């Protein structure tokens, strides 16, 4: 129930792997963020140097955060579209970490991937809509913002607009056409809430990859798991701990290291390497290598 039992034989990658191949581990939820797509050429926000916050000087905006806030987008969409042009990859190639999740799906272990990313790489790796909660939406589709229109446009249309440097307008009514992303200030999709209500009732492992767990309400997903569900973080830095200050005012933060630690494991490094290591323990390494090479070769030949 709400008891804090220890189901990992040890708080290591090796322990997680053994658990994953026990009968108790049938339903895995992945929570992922921008860290899983940095090796695919898309910057995160927070990384020193290569993160976007460091690299937004030219846009002459108040504080680097505004270009992804809904009120600033409403005032002027042009900076956002300009940056989208700058960031739009020539080629969409999912990472090892993406294909690791594809392996979970093919093995019948994936209950859901909840992603904060908007880059569509989960879809390209072969996660289906069913499998996915795009908690912050997606560039995959776009919609005219006009309540009485709401015409849908595909990414090839939006891409053309973004590269032509033409602010996207609706062909039916000439209102702005906006990528289906959730800007800061916006409500998350209803899907997010209903999947969360059901999925966290019966999850056996939470795998958390490439996110700082600072964006809410996404971050609070870690507290929705049962207290005995193991949680593995694969990330360059620890994340999701309780802050010693905020934590003094009235969910289960990550606890990898304290005296009371019983189910949380942190593997610090590149997501691609951590997933590769985990795959190796599970005996999936060659499968993973073959999938990535074949999928990448297939993309390379488009």
């Amino acid at each position: 129930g709400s008891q804090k039992e220890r189901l990992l034989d040890e708080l290591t990658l090796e322990g997680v792997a053994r658990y994953m191949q026990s009968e108790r581990c049938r339903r895995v939820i992945c929570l992922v963020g921008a860290g899983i797509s940095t090796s695919a050429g898309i910057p995160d926000f927070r990384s020193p140097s290569t993160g976007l916050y460091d690299n937004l000087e030219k846009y002459h905006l108040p504080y680097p955060e505004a270009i992804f806030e809904i009120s600033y987008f409403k005032k002027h969409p042009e900076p956002f579209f300009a940056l989208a042009k700058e960031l739009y990859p020539g080629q969409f190639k999912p990472t090892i970490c993406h294909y690791f999740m594809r392996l979970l799906k093919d093995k019948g272990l994936l209950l859901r991937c909840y992603t904060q990313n908007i880059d569509t790489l989960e879809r390209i790796a072969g996660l289906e809509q069913e499998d996915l909660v795009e908690a912050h939406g997606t560039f995959y589709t776009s919609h005219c913002v006009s309540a009485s229109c709401r015409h849908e446009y595909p990414l090839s249309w939006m891409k053309e607009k973004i590269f032509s440097e033409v602010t996207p307008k609706c062909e039916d009514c000439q209102s702005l056409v906006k990528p289906d992303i959730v800007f800061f200030g916006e409500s998350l999709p209803a899907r997010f809430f209903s999947c969360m209500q059901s999925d966290f009732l019966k999850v056996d492992l939470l795998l958390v990859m490439g996110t700082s767990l600072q964006v809410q309400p996404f971050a609070s997903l870690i507290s929705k798991a049962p207290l005995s569900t193991p949680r593995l973080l694969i990330n360059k830095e620890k994340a999701g701990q309780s802050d010693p200050f905020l934590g003094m005012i009235m969910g289960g933060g990550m606890d990898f290291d304290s005296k009371k630690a019983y189910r949380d494991v942190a593997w610090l490094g590149e997501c691609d390497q951590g997933c590769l290591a985990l795959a190796e323990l599970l005996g999936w390494k060659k499968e993973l290598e073959d999938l990535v090479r074949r999928e990448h070769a297939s993309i390379d030949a488009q």
Partner: peptide, 6 residues
Amino acid sequence: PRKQLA
């Protein structure tokens, strides 16, 4: 609730 930093 709304997308937001903490």
